[PDB]
Design a protein around this ligand. Structure first.
Ligand SMILES: [Zn+2]
Ligand SMILES: [Zn+2]
Ligand SMILES: [Zn+2]
Length: 122
């Protein structure tokens, strides 16, 4: 019928707090990578896909990046799955644990939040 990992991958409460002064379309995990000096290699001026964890508001870069930090975040061993990311590109949802693209509606929390987060980033 739908994905049932909604709550498992979407946590509205911590979303609100994350998106407050969050950076939009900016994989924060790129920025928080103090290891390197660049975190944005101006010579290439990259703009990868940006997937936002619907679970915590962690913004990562998807497949179109070298790091694919969004997936690293999924592959991160943790108690909650955080397996829901929405694309700031096509506004799709990806559920890593479903391993497909998720669809939602107006009564579905995922849709509600995507709508909300879209209002955030808008
Ligand atoms: Zn990144
Ligand atoms: Zn997360
Ligand atoms: Zn799912």
């Amino acid at each position: 019928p739908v994905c049932r990992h909604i709550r498992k991958g979407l946590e509205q409460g911590n979303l609100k707090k994350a998106l407050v002064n969050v950076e939009w379309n900016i994989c924060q995990d790129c920025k928080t990578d103090n290891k390197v000096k660049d975190k944005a290699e101006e010579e290439t001026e990259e703009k990868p896909s940006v997937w936002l964890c619907l679970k915590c508001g962690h913004q990562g870069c998807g497949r179109n990046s070298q790091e694919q930090h969004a997936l690293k975040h999924y592959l991160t061993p943790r108690s909650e799955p955080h397996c829901l990311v929405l694309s700031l590109d096509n506004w799709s949802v990806w559920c890593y644990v479903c391993d497909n693209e998720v669809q939602y509606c107006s009564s579905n929390q995922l849709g509600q939040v995507v709508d909300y987060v879209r209002k955030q980033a808008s």
